[PDB]
């Protein structure tokens, strides 16, 4: 069946107007897809904003509206506010089946952009006894909440053995994330330089160890 | 106010059966169509079942057709999802929602389903020390690597709750059927290593506690 796609992430300022789009692989969204828009707020809290393309539910502020634009369904937030920083999912009706898009992470700047503080840790001697070596790269205090992490071992890009968590919101409303490089203790011993590189808002912060 | 409360999830093994419940209140349950939707650990939403007012039409995505059966008991204001042949791809938070004139407006709080063959396993705890002495400045960051446990959760404290500012405990990752997570704390450089810093890791399902001292 259909593949529904949405922007991954978007940033706006409060008082501004933003539009989120939702496309079907099938060709063109129409009125018979009854496009819905659902909001996801921190702590898995879901609220239906719009259904049947442009019918707003009761209680949803008037700044949310829906429409069809260029063959796509769209959500417009006229005058985005600070509490609008959330994930917005799209859902398209196809003959009795709902198909949801991957969600758009919307950021509404409620504070100054803040760069990740990165720390890279070497595997501990106790773990080396089990013949495994975990490198840990902790990334905190960044805003907005979207980062990109790349690893290098002896200057070569790493393509497997790495796992990074999805950014999670801190108590000061900045985000934090973690990344892991999992080697065998032999491998660790055979390489000499290890790098964790974090890309945030076009700037790269890199931590390394020999 | 409209209220939807799902329940019945927990830990099950692949191949097993389970029935979830969605208890409605505050509106006339029988008038509206309903759906179950789930949210996967990767954070994607998947619609999984639908039933109409009257219960005469039901529909399901192909991934669960033949395994899941949705039903409703209007006398009790409750929506059911009967699940059989569970697979690890069913691991998700399940939510019921009502169709209020084509708007999916109210959603329950959700109920957690974990489909896994893993056995209960305490974590091993490894110290994360700075090591390379060419630090940054006057604050030092330490950590605990909590590896290989199952199932969630684990709770981490520093110096039995004495140390609470600057602690970051990261969401877990699933590596090889077991979870791994980390926690870190930033402390003034005059503190450590002169004074002791320990991470206290509790794993309730195994009734296990590990206290790990962080040494340079």
d(CA B179, CA A180): 13
Phi, psi of A28 (to 5 degrees): -145, 130
- Which residue, B95, B117, B139, sits at the end of a domain? B117
CATH number of the domain enclosing B214: 2.60.40.10
d(CA A131, CA A121): 17
Q: Look up residue B27 and give its two tokens.
A: 């509106």
Q: Which residue has the tokens 């952009």?
A: A113
- Contact (CB, 8 A) for B185 and B143: yes
Closest CA to A37 of A115, A83, A92, A114: A92
- B158 & B105 share domain: no
No. of helices (H) and no. of strands (E), chain A: 2, 20
Question: What's the total number of domains in chain B?
Answer: 2
State whether A180 and B180 contact (CB < 8 Å): yes
Nearest C-alpha of chain A: how many angstroms from B119? 20
- Contact (CB, 8 A) for A39 and B89: no
Q: Look up residue A202 and give its two tokens.
A: 């076009």
CB proximity A100 to B under 8 Å:
yes
Question: Technique behind this structure?
Answer: X-ray
Q: How many CB atoms lie within 10 A of CB B19?
A: 12
Is the dihedral angle over the CA atoms A187, A189, A191, A194 positive or is it negative? positive
Task: Please tell me what DSSP assigns to residue B204.
Answer: G
Hey, is B77 helix, strand or coil? coil
Residues 6+ apart with CB under 8 A from B57: A96, B50, B51
State whether A100 and B47 contact (CB < 8 Å): yes
Is the dihedral angle over the CA atoms B158, B163, B168, B171 positive or is it negative? positive
Residues 6+ apart with CB under 8 A from A59: none
| Architecture per CATH, A111-209 | Sandwich (2.60)
CB proximity B101 to A under 8 Å:
yes
- Which residue, B84, B117, B150, sits at the end of a domain? B117
What CATH homologous superfamily does A1-110 map to?
Immunoglobulins (2.60.40.10)
Neighbour-count burial for B108-147, b at 16+ CB within 10 Å, e otherwise: bbbbebbbbebeebbbbbbbbbbeeeeeeeeebbbbbbbb
- B156 & B109 share domain: no
d(CA A33, CA A27): 12
Burial status of residue B9 (CB atoms within 10 A of its CB: 0-12, 13-18, 19 or more)? buried
Give the distance, in angstroms, between the CA of residue B89 and the centroid of all CA atoms in the same chain: 14
Q: Look up residue A194 and give its two tokens.
A: 């290890």
- B167 & B90 share domain: no
- B65 & B154 share domain: no
β-partners of residue A74 are: A21, A67
Q: For residue B50, what are the domain limits?
A: 1-117
d(CA A197, CA A182): 16
- Which residue, B101, B117, B133, sits at the end of a domain? B117
Q: Look up residue A14 and give its two tokens.
A: 């409060």
d(CA B106, CA B3): 8
Residues shown for chain B:
216
Q: H or E segment at B144?
A: strand B139-149
Phi-psi domain of A44 (left: phi exceeds 0; alpha: psi -120 through 50; beta: other): left
Nearest C-alpha of chain A: how many angstroms from B85? 22
β-partners of residue B19 are: B82
CB proximity B157 to A under 8 Å:
no
d(CA A49, CA A36): 7
Closest CA to A82 of A57, A63, A103: A63
d(CA B118, CA B175): 12
- B133 & B107 share domain: no
The domain spans of chain A are: 1-110, 111-209
d(CA A25, CA A3): 5
Q: Look up residue B146 and give its two tokens.
A: 């909590």
């Amino acid at each position: 069946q259909a593949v529904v796609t949405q922007e991954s992430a978007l940033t706006t300022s409060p008082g501004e107007t933003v539009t989120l789009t939702c496309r079907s692989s099938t060709g063109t969204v129409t009125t018979s897809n009854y496009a819905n828009w659902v909001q996801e707020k921190p702590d898995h809290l879901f609220t239906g904003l719009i259904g049947a393309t442009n019918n707003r539910a009761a209680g949803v502020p008037v700044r949310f509206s829906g429409s069809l634009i260029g063959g796509k369904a769209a959500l417009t937030i006229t005058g985005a506010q600070t509490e609008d920083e959330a994930i917005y999912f799209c859902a398209l009706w196809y003959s009795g089946h709902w198909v949801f898009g991957g969600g758009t992470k919307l950021t509404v700047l409620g504070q100054p952009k803040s760069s990740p503080s990165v720390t890279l840790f070497p595997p501990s001697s106790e773990e080396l006894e089990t013949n495994k070596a975990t490198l840990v790269c902790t990334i905190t205090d960044f805003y907005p909440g979207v980062v990109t992490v790349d690893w290098k071992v002896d200057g070569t890009p790493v393509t497997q053995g790495m796992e990074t968590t999805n950014p999670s919101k801190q108590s000061n409303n900045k985000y934090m994330a973690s990344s892991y490089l999992t080697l065998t203790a032999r491998a660790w011993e055979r390489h000499s330089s290890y790098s964790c590189q974090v890309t945030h808002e076009g700037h790269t912060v890199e931590k390394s160890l020999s | 106010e409209v209220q939807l409360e799902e329940s019945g999830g927990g830990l099950v093994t692949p191949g097993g059966s389970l029935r979830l419940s969605c208890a409605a209140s505050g509106y006339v349950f029988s008038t509206y169509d309903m759906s179950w939707v789930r949210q996967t650990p990767e954070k994607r939403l998947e619609w999984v079942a639908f039933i109409s007012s009257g219960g005469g039409r039901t529909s399901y995505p192909d991934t669960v057709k033949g395994r899941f059966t949705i039903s409703r008991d209007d006398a009790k204001n409750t929506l059911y999802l009967q699940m059989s042949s569970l697979q690890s791809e069913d691991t998700a938070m399940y939510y019921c929602t009502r169709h209020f004139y084509a708007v999916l407006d109210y959603w329950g709080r959700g109920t957690t389903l974990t489909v896994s063959s893993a056995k209960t396993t305490p974590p091993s705890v490894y110290p994360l020390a700075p090591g390379s002495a060419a630090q940054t400045n006057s604050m030092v960051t330490l950590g605990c690597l909590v590896k290989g446990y199952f199932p969630e959760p684990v709770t981490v404290t520093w110096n039995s709750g004495s140390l609470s500012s600057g602690v970051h405990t990261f969401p877990a990752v699933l590596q090889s059927d077991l979870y791994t997570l980390s926690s870190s704390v930033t402390v003034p450089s005059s503190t450590w290593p002169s004074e002791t810093v320990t991470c206290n890791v509790a794993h309730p399902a195994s009734s296990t506690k590990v206290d790990k001292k962080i040494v340079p």
